[PDB]
Amino acid sequence: SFEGQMAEYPTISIDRFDRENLRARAYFLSHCHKDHMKGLRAPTLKRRLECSLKVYLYCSPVTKELLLTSPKYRFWKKRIISIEIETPTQISLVDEASGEKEEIVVTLLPAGHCPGSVMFLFQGNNGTVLYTGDFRLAQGEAARMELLHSGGRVKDIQSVYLDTTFCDPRFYQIPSREECLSGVLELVRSWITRSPYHVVWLNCKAAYGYEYLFTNLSEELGVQVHVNKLDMFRNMPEILHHLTTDRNTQIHACRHPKAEEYFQWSKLPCGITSRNRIPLHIISIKPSTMWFGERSRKTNVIVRTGESSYRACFSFHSSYSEIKDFLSYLCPVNAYPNVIPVGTTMDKVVEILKPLCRS
Ligand SMILES: [Zn+2]
Ligand SMILES: [Zn+2]
């Protein structure tokens, strides 16, 4: 897994804040997932901060909002500089100990992974590098990103630090964002139009990224989504007005440590079985990655798992096909995997990445 330092600009730390990253001249956070925040509130880094007053964390406006909602990250409050998307910004890296100054230009590109998720394009004295963080980009998407181009053609990119979550031909294709939403929208409509007592439980992991499912169910069916907490979205109206803490809705994305046991007893995670003494009829819809081999005999994005239970195709990460199209297109000198998944090896991932790089 990425240990925070790119060879080309070793004095900045991205998405890793422990060990050798405690010496960084500047910090970057691609997105507000725990996987990418290791060390970010170690006492020793809070200490580092108080002594080195010229060290800052850079991220999207949305990532800043989501990080500064959580009380354990409020010590960052005055040391976070948000940079607007698609806005090449010059950063002054200064070494406190030696007085050495380096100048670097950073561009935040949308990563399509969760609210505030960005890729970081770095331009300075040691070549152009792209850190993707976690990303999901449809085929052709890189070719339509203006700031990956100079004079109509792809920039000379020395190195790409790439999300390789599904970097194996096993995961050849994954249904698109729009097919996944279409399949969930239709199942939810088919259920909740039957009677006011027919309700959906969206069984989502406790992590940013499902907001656009809630947003699109809410818009299309005129029904707000029940959630445990929405205070992270208090300064984010485009999301917030699709959510509610009011349990009087037919669409729930609430959570509870015993939600599975609750479901067995026709109880929603927020604790209701009934409305006006009438029992609810609950179905569970569990977003779950589904994939299809090269032979394109794709199946339904909805899969029924029991009397009242469904899985729905959903992915936070690019398919093998999307990774190859993205890297193929950029044709960097070097590609480095941000992760080696449990079922593959560094050797097999590099054997996939090497042919898509220059020469
Ligand atoms: Zn992530
Ligand atoms: Zn609920």
UniProtKB/Swiss-Prot annotation:
User: What effect on the protein does mutating residue 35 to N/A have, as reported in its record?
Assistant: Abolishes PRKDC-dependent endonuclease activity and V(D)J recombination
Location relative to the cell: Nucleus
Organs and tissues of expression: Ubiquitously expressed, with highest levels in the kidney, lung, pancreas and placenta (at the mRNA level). Expression is not increased in thymus or bone marrow, sites of V(D)J recombination.
Its domain of life reads Eukaryota
Major enzyme class: hydrolase
Just give the chief location class.
nucleus
* Family of the protein in this entry: Belongs to the DNA repair metallo-beta-lactamase (DRMBL) family.
Q: What is this protein called?
A: Protein artemis
**Annotated organism of origin:** Homo sapiens (Human)
What's the source species' lineage?
Answer: Eukaryota, Metazoa, Chordata, Craniata, Vertebrata
GN (gene name): DCLRE1C
Write the span of the intact protein that is present: 3 to 361 of 692
